[PDB]
Design a protein around this ligand. Sequence first.
Ligand code: HC4
Length: 125
Amino acid sequence: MEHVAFGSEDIENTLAKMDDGQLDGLAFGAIQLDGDGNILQYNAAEGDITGRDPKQVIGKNFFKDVAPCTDSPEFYGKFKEGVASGNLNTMFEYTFDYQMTPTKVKVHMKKALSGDSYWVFVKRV
Ligand SMILES: *C(=O)/C=C/c1ccc(O)cc1
């Protein structure tokens, strides 16, 4: 076995129905979004490094109301491509340095199978 897997234990499935402790003990924050970039879920992993938390970032747009860096052609860019492609599936090396310290993370976002969503999993590096 290797370290925590990015795709990990079928996140999307565990994020549509949640797991034991809402699978918040992962190493990659799992966030969802609804046709606009409105957070649907966030989990405690990423929210534990920055403190965002889901109940707090709930309603906050993860593109401009939570992270002002994801509103670019590399983060929201591949998101506007996956949303218009009908199968969001992209990743990229990003750095969360918003009002805080310099964070590094390998991102991996895909099209949630809940019916039509968009989740961005950030795996701290
Ligand atoms: C860009 O500045 C992103 C910042 C960010 C993303 C995710 C988090 O949990 C915290 C900050």
